[PDB]
Amino acid sequence: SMFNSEIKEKYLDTLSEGMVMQMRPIFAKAEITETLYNKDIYDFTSMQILELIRSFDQTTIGSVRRTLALLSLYIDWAISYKLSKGLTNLARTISEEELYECLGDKKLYITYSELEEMENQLVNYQSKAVLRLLFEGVSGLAHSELLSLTKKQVEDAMLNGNVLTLYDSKHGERKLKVSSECLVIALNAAQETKYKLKNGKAKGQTKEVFLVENDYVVKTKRTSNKGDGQASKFVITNLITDISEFFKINFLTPNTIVRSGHLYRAYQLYKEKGVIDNSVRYQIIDDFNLRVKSKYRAVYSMQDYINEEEVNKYYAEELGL
């Protein structure tokens, strides 16, 4: 039911009825972790706070942040009563990146607002560009659309209603409308000469590494001893890896990022329409000009992730629930 009951009930007794409603469930879900370490939340280490919250299995950064803030209030109260062994509130030491480590292991997809917050903490344009370009649908077989992308296509798209012309190694050409932000990020990434390691935090003597000189947006490193030609598959995965290491998350894969794009578009339609059904799915396909065997097949595949359950899960705050 609850760990350290008579102390928790003493804290609860100082809160409004509405606060008791928020704080109580946190203590019930917390109980099993507290009995595992045989100590209270207020004696938890940083890591144990981050683990604790992950066990609540929360979907969004926004909700994690509300959960952490509630936990701080309890810890401060416990500090002011000197129940805590430690003198400082360890929930307050939790940095912005560490918030992503709090995300539950069910989380598969990123919201648009999460994409924007992640972009803003990523110092490299190679990092920013792969995230965004994938979210907005630039991805062929083995990421051929993304790896074959040049300044010139980016430049042309800006002067053509933001409509990119994409080159795939299997099927050839595809037309995709993207955002202006995506195109400016793509244009920066295509002229970048350096790549800071560990997202600008590299501890070592070596902090940056030279990139190849070419007109491609996705660039191989000079020390890899590949040409001034296109990058391979593995560069995309390594760029996602370095993003994933900075935020310390394990759900982020090229396919996952591409879906999140589809899932954000589904939210926008759900807000106006109020249903998610095959009509929505057909619209997403031709909004992203989707490269598919057939459309009906794609619409079937999309029922795994494009549905009301997933949209309510990821976008609850934005929907007003």
Swiss-Prot record:
Pfam families found in the cross-reference section: MrpR_C_cat, MrpR_N_CB
GO molecular function: DNA binding
Protein name: SPbeta prophage-derived uncharacterized protein YopR
Species, as recorded: Bacillus subtilis (strain 168)
This protein's encoding gene: yopR
